[PDB]
Amino acid sequence: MQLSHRPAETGDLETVAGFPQDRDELFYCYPKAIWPFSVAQLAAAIAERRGSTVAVHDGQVLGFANFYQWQHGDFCALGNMMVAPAARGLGVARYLIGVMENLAREQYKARLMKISCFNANAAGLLLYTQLGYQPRAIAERHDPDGRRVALIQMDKPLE
């Protein structure tokens, strides 16, 4: 996979908003969103957040991420990670995580990245583990059905 990155642009929003395939996938990456996802919801997040970035391969936008918390000299928290359904498990998330780590270090002088992952997303938990993130706490949250879920709060020093 040859991959590149650039800041997200308005022209990318229809594409990226197409990435979540079901209510679960949307909840794992943007729990405040309501199904069905839309460009308006995506743009609302982008406006409130920082560092919205896309990953590109062979002319296709395949991934997106941003920060929902950022604290200069301290840490950032990574969210809205979305990957195109045809490109799952091909290293797009791993690549974007690395890009966002660099951006947190370089731009925000962060010493730490925080990643919070919902308990049902095994693939996320195992990826973040492979990338050196360790679990620190578990917090209660609720899903759209009012069911209790566990948010596993992980972090990694940036160096």
**96 belongs to an annotated ligand binding site:** no
Total residues at interface with ligand 4KO (CB under 6 A): 14
Distance CA 83, CA 89 (A): 9
**93 belongs to an annotated ligand binding site:** yes
Distance CA 77, CA 68 (A): 6
Scan residues 89-128 and list those touching ligand 4KO (CB under 6 A). 115-117
79 makes contact with ligand 4KO (CB under 6 A): yes
Q: ∠ CA 18-145-142 to the nearest 5 degrees?
A: 90
Count the residues in the chain: 159
Do residues 33 and 41 make contact, with C-beta atoms less than 8 angstroms apart? yes
Which residues contribute to the annotated binding site?
Answer: 5, 29, 57, 81, 83, 89, 91, 93-94, 121, 126, 130, 140, 142
Residues comprising the binding site for CoA? 29, 81, 83, 89, 91, 93-94, 121, 130
Query: Where along the sequence are the contacts to ligand 4KO (CB under 6 A)?
Result: 29-32, 68, 78-81, 115-117, 141, 151
